[PDB]
Amino acid sequence: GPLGSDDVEWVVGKDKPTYDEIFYTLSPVNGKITGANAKKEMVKSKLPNTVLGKIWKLADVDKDGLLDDEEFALANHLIKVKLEGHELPADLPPHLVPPSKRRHE
């Protein structure tokens, strides 16, 4: 193939349009949503406050206090696995973390 060495697959990239659709239903200003919008989302997700804060702590890898469609998709993926009866590692492995926040010099 092209690389072989680096053949990484972002798990969220396979079910991103769904969390993306949910992202648009929260009214995204300048392409992001504020804490309020993702808050009400996590509010009715029926997850504990602690988990919600932890998911946010993983989602905003960009650290801009706002959630882009990338970051919200990450959050929704964590919430989805929660709903599916799983736990989120509370950590950002190389297959959870969006390459959009990897700046190399």
């Binding site: 804490g35 996590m42 406050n49 946010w56 905003d60 650290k63 206090g65």
Partner: peptide, 12 residues
């Protein structure tokens, strides 16, 4: 130890 919490779910 307090730090600038930027998490709107906890605030503190």
């Amino acid at each position: 130890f307090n730090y600038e919490s930027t998490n709107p779910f906890t605030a503190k």
